[model samples]
Target: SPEFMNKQWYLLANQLILSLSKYEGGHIFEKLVDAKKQNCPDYYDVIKNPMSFSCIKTKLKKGQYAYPSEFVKDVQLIFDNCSLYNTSNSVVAITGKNIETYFNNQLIVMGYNNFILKEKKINDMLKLV
Candidate 1:
């Protein structure tokens, strides 16, 4: 069933990326952040793991994600990194929050309920530790 699942994941992932690309302020997240060019020398220090929509798309195309949750993790990493590196009320951080909310909502609407459950499990695990 891996083939079937991969097919479904590819379709869903592509749709999510496309939708995000079209969303307002979404263009900012399309590629990796240029910390040097952007003059944020401390960005990499705060964000140990960086992520972007383009990176996610490439991984998806290369079949790197074995499950939907794996893909979600990468997508969420982008928002998480943004939140960590930018001030709370800053435009970039706010945009990340908005897009993150929209992404979660889209997953629910698309019936990717397992991702939500997986997120809960991760939270619970963190709580226990």
Candidate 2:
């Protein structure tokens, strides 16, 4: 519990409500890696946190990520060097923030930077907390 209770942390994160194609992240890993490189160029950014959600928890009016176990492991690859980018240093947070704007993207188009934040001033955006 100490790690979670650490003062150096923020109690916020995000995840995809819908799975894209056969991938868990809804095919957003490419955009995330690019943004991390361009925005947080110094440190190798990665997806930090991930949580579980079943059909009962999600708010998707249409569909949701099927097989959450696979989803978790699938998305973990991008940050854990399982994908092509080898961006293991990057960390992605899988929890939600008080402002749902960053995580909510179901209404947006499928193949845009819809769910994840665009690769600009990303550190500043998370600084709002």
Candidate 3:
């Protein structure tokens, strides 16, 4: 629903030890925050995905994301910057474009397909890719 569209996961508030990132909260905490304000469902089944951190080649010749905090920031920047990209290669996939989303028999339909929304299994196979 567009109502829930505005909510998103942020590193500043997440679980999994937060690495070296300076966030302070987990999935439950985020839902709690959202629920307290929007009455988000505290139901039996919920979809709470863990935040991901990836690495992308940088302007620096041999730079590395040794610091967890900086690594997460860079990946988030990739996700953000790629929003304006109309090209396919903007995203560098080490897995040879065999992204699980592509392999999942899923086809992205354009603009309100006169159907109900379906949840994705992207988070389940996050690390194995």
- The all-Cα superposition gives candidate 3 an RMSD in Å to the true structure of 20.0
Rank candidates, lDDT, best first: 1, 2, 3
Clashes of 1: 0
**Residue 108, model 2, lDDT:** 43
Instruction: Kindly list the per-residue Cα lDDT of model 2 for residues 61-104, writing each as its tens digit.
Output: 33243322333343344333433233434333331111123323
What are the models' TM-scores? 0.83, 0.21, 0.20
Residue-level lDDT of model 3, residues 66-111, one tens digit each, is: 3333433443443333232224553323221333222122222221
Ranked by lDDT, the better of candidates 1 and 3 is 1
Which prediction has more favorable TM-score, 1 or 2? 1
Give the Cα-based TM-score of candidate 2 against the true structure.
Answer: 0.21
In the predicted model 1, the residue pairs found to clash are none
Task: Count the clashes in each prediction.
Answer: 0, 11, 1
Clashing pairs in 3: 12-23
lDDT of 1 by residue, 1-129 (tens): 546655776788889988998899999899987889988888778888888899998998888887678888888888988888889999999999999999999888886765446556766888999
After superposition, candidate 1 runs with Cα above 4 Å error: 114-129
